Amino acid sequence: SVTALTSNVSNKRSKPDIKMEPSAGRPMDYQVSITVIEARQLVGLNMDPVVCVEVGDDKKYTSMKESTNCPYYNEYFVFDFHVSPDVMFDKIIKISVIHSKNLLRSGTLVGSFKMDVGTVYSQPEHQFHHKWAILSDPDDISAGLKGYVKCDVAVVGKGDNIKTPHKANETDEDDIEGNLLLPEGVPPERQWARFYVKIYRAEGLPRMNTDLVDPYVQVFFAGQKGKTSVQKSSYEPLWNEQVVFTDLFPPLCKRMKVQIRDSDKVNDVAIGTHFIDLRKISNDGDKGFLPTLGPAWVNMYGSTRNYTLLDEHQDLNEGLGEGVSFRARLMLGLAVEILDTSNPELTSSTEVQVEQATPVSESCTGRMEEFFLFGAFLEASMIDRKNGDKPITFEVTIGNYGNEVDGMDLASVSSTPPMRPQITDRNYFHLPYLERKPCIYIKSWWPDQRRRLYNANIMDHIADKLEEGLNDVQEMIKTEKSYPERRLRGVLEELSCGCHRFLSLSDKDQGRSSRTRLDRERLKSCMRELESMGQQAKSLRAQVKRHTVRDKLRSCQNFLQKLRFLADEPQHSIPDVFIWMMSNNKRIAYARVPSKDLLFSIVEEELGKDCAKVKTLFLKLPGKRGFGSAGWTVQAKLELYLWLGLSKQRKDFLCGLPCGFEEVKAAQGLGLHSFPPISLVYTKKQAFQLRAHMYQARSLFAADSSGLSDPFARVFFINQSQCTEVLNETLCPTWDQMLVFDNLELYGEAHELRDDPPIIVIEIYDQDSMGKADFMGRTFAKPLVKMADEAYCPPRFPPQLEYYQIYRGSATAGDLLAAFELLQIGPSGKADLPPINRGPIMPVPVGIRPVLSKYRVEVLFWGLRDLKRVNLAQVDRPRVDIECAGKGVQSSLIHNYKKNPNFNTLVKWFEVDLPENELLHPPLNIRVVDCRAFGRYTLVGSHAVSSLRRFIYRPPDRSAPNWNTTGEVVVSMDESMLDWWSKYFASIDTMKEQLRQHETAKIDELKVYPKELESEFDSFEDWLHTFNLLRGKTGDDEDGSTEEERIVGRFKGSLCVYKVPLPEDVSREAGYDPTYGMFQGIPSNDPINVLVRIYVVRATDLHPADINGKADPYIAIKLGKTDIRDKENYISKQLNPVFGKSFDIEASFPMESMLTVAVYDWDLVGTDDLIGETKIDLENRFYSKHRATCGIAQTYSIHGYNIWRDPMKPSQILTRLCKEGKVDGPHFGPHGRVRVANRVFTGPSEIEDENGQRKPTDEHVALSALRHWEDIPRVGCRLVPEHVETRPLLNPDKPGIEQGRLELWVDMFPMDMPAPGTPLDISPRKPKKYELRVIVWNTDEVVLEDDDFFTGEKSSDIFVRGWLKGQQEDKQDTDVHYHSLTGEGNFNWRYLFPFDYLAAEEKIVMSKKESMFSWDETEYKIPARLTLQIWDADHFSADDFLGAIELDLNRFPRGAKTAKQCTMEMATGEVDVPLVSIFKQKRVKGWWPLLARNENDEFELTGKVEAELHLLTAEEAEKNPVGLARNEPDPLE
């Protein structure tokens, strides 16, 4: 485990990853789900808290809780967005607590918590679970903690899969400080800090008014904003003004948007936008540093600088996409000063100040040095013909230098001379440069910050080597080359060598005084991080082995993304080089090359990856026009030589070009050797011949309404194009055509031509009837070059066919099995070339085409399910035509699809020559057609089995010890208040424990699956497979209808592919009979009635479908003809419903087998909205060898909560499984044992019924045999247990985002068997009725609120206010103890609080209307908390709140014996007071403190109350009745 390969093994370098659609600016469906659970320790006096949840500009509110500092909400909010990831992660999640909000007055804020979406998305599962948001006053740095809000915050994108923890009972003493809502590394106490965004000056602004500009800089940070003054009429404005924000440190909103804007009274418009990432300019920990930046320049990009009345690329000026032109450069700085909040010498205001910053000079950013940029357009081809045949120039700009139309000694030549295009084909032009390549040269002046670009070049060189190595490892894993773990160890060796090389290279020029603080701190951080990366790579090299390569590759992806993170320099020096295509002086398409990629250095690692090299550029349409249908066509394709560096370093600026050219220079440059040329005239040229072996394609795009295409491939090389033949009605053509590009001319002897060949562009096109063609995708290739002196010999020659990944923009559009070679025509002519062996169409020659071996494909035709309407007519006589590689077989004609969609001949077969390499196997096509009369066959649908590797038969490994089947192996094994919810909650807790164990017994259990049941049992495809038939054109990833709409049916069956010379012992061990073949043990195809019983347990995190933020869910189940819609049993205003339902549907299997369980929002007016649905496909479950009909329980009992559901007893199931599998057994001897095959099981021999007396039985040991059925030697299989699966709910209207989790399970019982009993009572628990009697005896030391108007003595009119469920449903007041001069009150007043209680959830259940106008009663679950308050009664004003205590009825402090022993420490955060539950001790008498918050925001003792809590049931309360207050029965004094 030491040896390694340090060279590329596969041909991944010949398969470029060029894409025309970047991820920048692409909108994507996002969803932020925030579940406000509760709040604690809120700061206020008699507050009615409402939690306001804002994400971005959208805001939602919880319900109002009356008079509590520890409220409980359990309310679910969903915020939906369709924005780009950079916009979405910059949105500010603000969880606030307000009070006194009504229809006209905004609420008074208690505290707020700020964090952005990107901090939530950087979590391990893109979420926080059960974490407490630290509330702080956002308008006061001297204010303390304002409370905590326990909440879940989750962010999901389109296609994200999140393991959400299940909603168990929350009956635990949760820790607030150990579970805060902070990312890891952020301290629990966050100081206040000031963010000085110093803005000095700007340069090179474009035209904005018509013609001047009046710029200012607006800075956005963490939801705050502030702007500088307006510098009127200035292209080079000077502010010297700092925008000072005041915010918590470290900030959880980690990006800052600096944006130059133009002042205008008509419309305020953005000029340019740069985002300062605070991650890249700071580090955390003891070795970290505060966020610092500058004083250094920053380059902003956006739309084109020409003025228009309206700008369709205005979003580029807002930073919402990739900038297509240089807008301005802004000299910028940032400093963070941590404030001392305990010092009253500074103001405590948090408002954004705009002050005068200290001015710094232009020399602080570095001395200006002359930079020389040179370009040479060697090739221009693949120009879009929709631009017209007008003359085409290429204008190169860098900053404003070279922009002679919109921007603002040697004279710079920035544009090529105009050249009229010539036709390549019907879609593309090319410019005929030939021997005369046009050239550009631009003089520019930038500050000398080349050290930053050199360090970024070294880091990106290490990242490029690592990325090429990981792509090599991934590719030769995919193509199954030998020893992938040897290459990855060499990749880690190269990574550690590069990381060690960076430490020796980046220490140069540290003595320069022009370095900023960010330069020094980031150099130290990069040195430390790359040293740790090198040591981690050397440690990970020892862990790379044969079986662990595929996850150390994922670990190396973390090193790759960390290198890409560290390589981005935040202080820009030189703006990016833009290359624009122009015709009729109109900007058409652009490319953007970073200037660090073109920068020249003596050191090889500091050299840019594109400096002194011919770079293949693909110009794209600016802004949104580069995506979608407009960006499909190649706008242009350039082979552009580029060099950038100092003008003192331009001695070797022509060294990377191909040799053999004469420099033709300008008229002022005659006689000067150092003058750059305006053109190159090549005299040397090399003849070449390209062979494009277009053999095959697969999985291609469907561009016709039948779901197929007519593909042909057009191959582009230099300025030439050739086409393959059109193959009709296929998505996997076998073109088998070699395209010979004869007498190609490569101008000049290109350096390293064998290592960097010119790129080949291949475009697939669907031929249509009227001569037009639909774009089907594009792949790229690099030919494997033969020189004239080379021999056409192995191992390099002839080239092997490889799969090239085709892209329809960003989506994958199949693979192209092809090989490309570029053979040089030598001095002897074409006789040195290999010989070339359908008319003029040439086949792929022998040695490149795959060697074929004979196979047999046996097809099981099981049935056809859910065939939709073809055209408008119903399918009635379907037939399945299956074709692979030109051969095939056709199924028996289904003479009537309605009565039985089954095939008379179960298995057919055909023989077909397939390649010896199983990776080169062509896909097999299933094609269902409706056989009408007179030969009028119409296409119903088509499925493409892309890989036959799943269906390839190989003989089983009978040398495994499981098959040995010899030698005996012995395997051994109130209270009546339990229900199904007991075992369900036990299984939920157990599943939580196994999830904790995988990350790092008195109650019998089932198996709770966090996913579907299909996810744990290989989708029940052990013998029967599903093939979704498709029709219609494929939809795009944006504005498409996706694959699920195109499904027009399902074909049921299997495939079995093997080499047709089978050995006779292989065929006999497979049991080949002539009636079926390889498909043995196939069950009966006859129709059978099946009782389907769907138990719906609950749903969690349902998407809101009403205007109040909630929904009214009910269960609608569709199965065959049966369409149950349970609208009468909807649960009102609940997003986490507990259904507890069971539905019985008698379905005719295997026809009515597609089960759809859906959740619908009931609406009083209009149609009921769909929340989500899931498809279960019960046919695969019913016919599986896993026995997914009825789940098998852990232990057997015939009564109670653990009752055996199945009408077949475990002995009958064991007998059936032994009979079907031909296993000798079951052999019951005595009742405590059974022998099945070579294994003997033992267990208990007696069962107990409801009376509890014993009875001998065999069912325990039979169930023990069924639980260990996987260990059976011959036909052993893991049986499906009794389970609750969690199926996600999907909406076609909002695709890709799961918006519900429906927990259920399905039981199936054949009706020819004995019927099952009644369904299980999984209905939710009825709450036990109780009554809490709180006798308020006295009060002591209550504060005196009133003051005497005439004599000044203090007094208080004390009365006690108590409630259990709420102020509007359980409020009871004692009579007023008037005129208390010492705080003593005498009440002897009894409260009565009847309430319904769930013991497991510890929640009071109450049914009440949400409002006065609400249609129905809503079930609410609140914590059982008794609130006792003291008040002062006023005759001519409102009563005054004095103090309160909130006693949680499970965790309240024990009351003191006297009033003197009562202190504040009973109710505050001290742990020294023991806790007492009223549900256990049943009577508590004592004294309790009453607390109120003063204006210093601490708690104070405002009184004490003597109380006697006494909990009974309703049955105990009825047999011992008492009256309210002091009334009979049991009167009080």
Ligand SMILES: CCCCCC(=O)OC[C@H](COP(=O)(O)OC[C@H](N)C(=O)O)OC(=O)CCCCC
């Ligand atoms: C005039 C008062 C307007 C008040 C605001 C408004 O538009 O209310 C729509 C209401 C409620 O409809 P939903 O709950 O489905 O809307 C919620 C939505 N599905 C969502 O999830 O966003 O519908 C009607 O009034 C009847 C319409 C059809 C009548 C045939």
Ligand SMILES: CCCCCC(=O)OC[C@H](COP(=O)(O)OC[C@H](N)C(=O)O)OC(=O)CCCCC
């Ligand atoms: C058909 C005759 C009129 C029937 C009017 C009626 O009852 O409308 C229903 C709603 C209240 O009922 P729900 O919110 O439960 O809606 C039910 C369920 N959650 C749903 O989604 O629809 O009425 C208002 O909002 C009126 C507020 C007026 C304030 C002044």
Ligand SMILES: [Ca+2]
């Ligand atoms: Ca203006």
Ligand SMILES: [Ca+2]
């Ligand atoms: Ca078409």
Ligand SMILES: [Ca+2]
């Ligand atoms: Ca077509």
Ligand SMILES: [Ca+2]
């Ligand atoms: Ca609705």
Ligand SMILES: [Ca+2]
């Ligand atoms: Ca509704």
Ligand SMILES: [Ca+2]
């Ligand atoms: Ca509706």
Ligand SMILES: [Ca+2]
């Ligand atoms: Ca008063």
Ligand SMILES: [Ca+2]
């Ligand atoms: Ca009073």
Ligand SMILES: [Ca+2]
């Ligand atoms: Ca008052």
